[PDB]
Amino acid sequence: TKRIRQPIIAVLGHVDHGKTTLLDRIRKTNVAAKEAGGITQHIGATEVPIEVVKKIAGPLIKLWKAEIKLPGLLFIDTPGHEAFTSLRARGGSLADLAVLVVDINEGFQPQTIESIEILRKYRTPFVVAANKIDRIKGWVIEEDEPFLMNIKKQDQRAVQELETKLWELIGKFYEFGFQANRFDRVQNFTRELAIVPISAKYGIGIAELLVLIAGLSQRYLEEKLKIEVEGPARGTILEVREEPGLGHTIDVIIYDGTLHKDDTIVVGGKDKAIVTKIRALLKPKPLDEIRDPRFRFDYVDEVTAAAGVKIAAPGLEEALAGSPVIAAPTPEDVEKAKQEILEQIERVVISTDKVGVIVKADTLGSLEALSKELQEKEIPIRKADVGNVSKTDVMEALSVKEEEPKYGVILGFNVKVNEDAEEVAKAKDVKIFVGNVIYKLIEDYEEWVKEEEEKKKRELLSKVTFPGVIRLYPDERYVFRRSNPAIVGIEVIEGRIKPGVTLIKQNGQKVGVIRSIKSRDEFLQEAKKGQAVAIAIEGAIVGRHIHPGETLYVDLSRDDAITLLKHLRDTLEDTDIKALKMIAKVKAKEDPFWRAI
Numbered sequence: 343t344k345r346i347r348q349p350i351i352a353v354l355g356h357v358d359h360g361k362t363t364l365l366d367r368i369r370k371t372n373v374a375a376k377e378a379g380g381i382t383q384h385i386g387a388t389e390v391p392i393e394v395v396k397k398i399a400g401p402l403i404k405l406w407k408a409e410i411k412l413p414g415l416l417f418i419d420t421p422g423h424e425a426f427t428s429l430r431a432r433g434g435s436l437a438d439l440a441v442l443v444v445d446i447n448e449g450f451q452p453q454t455i456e457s458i459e460i461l462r463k464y465r466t467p468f469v470v471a472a473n474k475i476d477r478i479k480g481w482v483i484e485e486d487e488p489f490l491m492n493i494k495k496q497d498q499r500a501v502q503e504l505e506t507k508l509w510e511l512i513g514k515f516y517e518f519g520f521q522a523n524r525f526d527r528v529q530n531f532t533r534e535l536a537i538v539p540i541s542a543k544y545g546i547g548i549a550e551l552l553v554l555i556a557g558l559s560q561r562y563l564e565e566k567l568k569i570e571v572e573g574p575a576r577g578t579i580l581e582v583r584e585e586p587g588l589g590h591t592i593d594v595i596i597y598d599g600t601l602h603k604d605d606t607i608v609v610g611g612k613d614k615a616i617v618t619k620i621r622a623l624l625k626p627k628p629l630d631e632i633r634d635p636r637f638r639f640d641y642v643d644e645v646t647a648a649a650g651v652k653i654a655a656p657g658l659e660e661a662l663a664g665s666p667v668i669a670a671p672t673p674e675d676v677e678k679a680k681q682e683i684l685e686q687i688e689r690v691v692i693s694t695d696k697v698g699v700i701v702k703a704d705t706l707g708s709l710e711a712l713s714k715e716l717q718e719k720e721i722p723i724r725k726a727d728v729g730n731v732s733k734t735d736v737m738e739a740l741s742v743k744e745e746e747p748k749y750g751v752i753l754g755f756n757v758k759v760n761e762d763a764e765e766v767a768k769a770k771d772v773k774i775f776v777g778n779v780i781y782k783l784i785e786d787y788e789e790w791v792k793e794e795e796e797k798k799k800r801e802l803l804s805k806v807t808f809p810g811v812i813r814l815y816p817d818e819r820y821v822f823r824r825s826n827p828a829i830v831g832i833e834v835i836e837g838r839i840k841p842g843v844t845l846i847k848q849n850g851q852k853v854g855v856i857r858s859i860k861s862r863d864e865f866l867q868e869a870k871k872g873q874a875v876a877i878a879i880e881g882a883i884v885g886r887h888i889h890p891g892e893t894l895y896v897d898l899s900r901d902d903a904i905t906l907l908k909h910l911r912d913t914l915e916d917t918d919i920k921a922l923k924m925i926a927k928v929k930a931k932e933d934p935f936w937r938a939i
C-alpha cells in the first residue's frame with residue numbers, strides 16, 4: 343500500500359500572465375518523458391510522476407541537495423484565485439503549495455497583490471515564476487531548455503534586462519514581507535522566496551521549476567503527505583454538475599484517505615450539511631483506451647491519496663463548490679462532520695442589522711475573501727451570504743439606503759443577479775455591482791462613492807440661492823413689457839442672478855419671481871456682476887410696485903445664508919459677499935438674524 347501521497351499544486355497569477363499556458367506546458371513535458379506507462383488520470387487534475395521530473399531535470403536534480411521520495415505532483419487543471427479559495431474540512435486551502443505566475447515584463451498587477459495576501463492568510467508555501475522572458479528584446483529561445491542552460495546563450499544586453507526586472511520584482515516582494523531572489527541565489531528556502539525565470543510558451547526553465555516544486559513540497563509537507571491509505575476520505579468540491587446521464591454529481595479532489603463507492607459522505611452546502619451515500623465513483627479511462635470523446639470515464643471502486651474523482655450520489659443538488667466532502671463510517675462520524683461543516687458556515691456567513699453593505703459570493707472561500715478585503719478598507723458589512731442576489735437582499739439594501747445612502751449597495755462576486763431582483767434594484771435605486779475579481783469590485787464601488795459624493799455637492803449648489811444685487815435702468819427705453827410678465831433691462835450690481843429667484847425692494851417687499859434672463863437673442867441661466875441683461879419678473883407690473891432706476895435685491899433665507907457662509911464658503915467671490923452683506927442690511931430691519939451679516 344502507498345506510503346506518501348503527492349502534493350496538490352495550484353497555479354495563481356494575474357490574468358493573461360500565463361497561468362493556463364504553464365499548466366499546458368507541464369502536461370506536454372509529461373508525454374515527452376512518459377516512457378511506456380499509463381499515468382494515473384484524474385478528474386480535473388493532471389499527475390506528473392517524479393520519473394518525468396527527474397529525467398527532465400537531468401543533473402539539475404542536484405540543485406536541491408536532497409533526495410525526493412515523492413511519487414509525483416498533482417496539478418489542478420483550473421488555475422487562479424477562484425480555484426485557490428476552495429478550502430478543506432480544516433479551513434485550509436486544498437493546495438499544498440502554489441505557483442505564483444508573474445509576467446516579467448508587466449510586473450506586479452492587482453491579482454498578484456490579491457493572491458499574495460491570500461497565500462499568507464492560508465500560510466501556503468509557494469514558488470514565483472517570472473514568465474514571458476522570451477519577449478525580452480533579443481532573447482535566444484531554445485525549446486524545453488532549462489533556464490540555467492538557456493541563460494548562458496544570452497548577451498549582456500538581455501541579461502541586464504532580466505536582472506533589472508528581477509530587481510523590481512524583489513522590491514515589490516520585500517514590500518510585502520517576502521525576501522525574494524533568483525532560485526540559484528537562494529540559500530535558505532524556508533526563510534526566502536525563490537523566483538524561477540521561465541517561458542511557458544517554449545518550456546524554458548520548466549525543469550528548474552518542477553525540481554523546486556517537488557523539493558519544497560517534500561521539505562514543507564513531509565509529515566502530512568504521509569497519509570495512511572486506510573483512513574476515511576476527506577476532500578474538497580471543485581465543481582457541481584447536473585450531468586445529463588449521471589444526474590447531480592460533484593467533482594472533488596480527495597486530499598486524505600481512501601474513498602469507496604460504498605461510503606457515506608457528509609457534503610457541505612450553503613446553509614446545511616448533506617448526508618448521503620455514494621452511488622458511483624468515476625475517473626477518466628487510461629489515455630489510450632479512449633475512442634469516443636463522449637465516453638471517457640470508467641466506474642471506479644476506490645480512489646486514495648491525492649486524486650480527482652467524480653462522485654455520483656443523491657442529494658448533491660444543494661452541494662456547494664469549494665466546500666468539503668467528509669466520509670463518515672459511523673453515526674458519530676456523521677455527527678462530527680455535520681458540526682465541522684456548519685461551524686465553517688457560521689464562521690463565514692454573517693447576518694446583522696449594522697448599517698453596512700451586502701456581500702454575495704459563489705463559494706465560502708471567496709465570500710470570506712471579499713468580506714475581509716472590505717474590512718481592510720474599513721467598509722462595514724450588514725450581511726455576507728453565499729448565493730445569488732435575491733429580491734430580499736435588495737429590500738435589505740433599501741433599508742440601509744434610507745439610513746446611509748453610501749452603504750445601501752450590494753456587492754456580488756461571481757454571482758448572477760436574480761430576474762425578480764433586477765427590477766427591484768432599479769425601482770428602488772439600489773446599486774448592484776457584478777464582477778469576477780475582488781479588487782475591481784471594490785474599486786467600482788469606491789468609484790461609485792466618488793460619483794455620488796460629488797453629485798451631492800452638485801445638488802446642494804443647485805438648491806441654494808446665491809446672493810445678487812441688480813438695478814433697473816432709469817429710461818423708459820429699457821421697459822420691454824409692463825405686465826404679465828414684466829420684462830425690464832437691468833444691470834446686476836453685485837453677486838449673481840438666476841431664474842426662479844424671488845426679488846425684494848429696499849424695504850424688503852417681495853415684488854415677484856424671475857421668469858427668465860435674456861441677453862441679446864439668447865436665454866441665460868445666470869448673470870454675474872457687470873452684465874446688462876433683460877429679465878422677466880412674474881407677478882410684477884412696471885410702475886405698480888417696481889420702478890425704473892430702482893435697486894432690487896435677491897431674496898435670501900436664513901438657510902441660504904448659513905449654507906453659503908459655513909458650507910459653500912470657497913464658492914463665494916468678493917462680489918458674492920458684498921451682495922450678501924447688502925441683502926443682510928435690508929433683511930435686518932425685520933429679522934435681527936441678519937445683524938450677523
Ligand SMILES: Nc1nc2c(ncn2[C@@H]2O[C@H](COP(=O)(O)OP(=O)(O)O)[C@@H](O)[C@H]2O)c(=O)[nH]1
Nearest residue numbers: 356357358359360361362363474476541542543
Ligand atoms: N511570448 C510569450 N507569450 C506567452 C508566454 N506564456 C503565455 N504567453 C501568451 O499569453 C497569452 C495568454 O496567456 P494565458 O496562459 O492564457 O494567461 P492566463 O489567463 O494567466 O492563463 C497567450 O496568448 C500566450 O500565447 C511566454 O512564455 N512567452
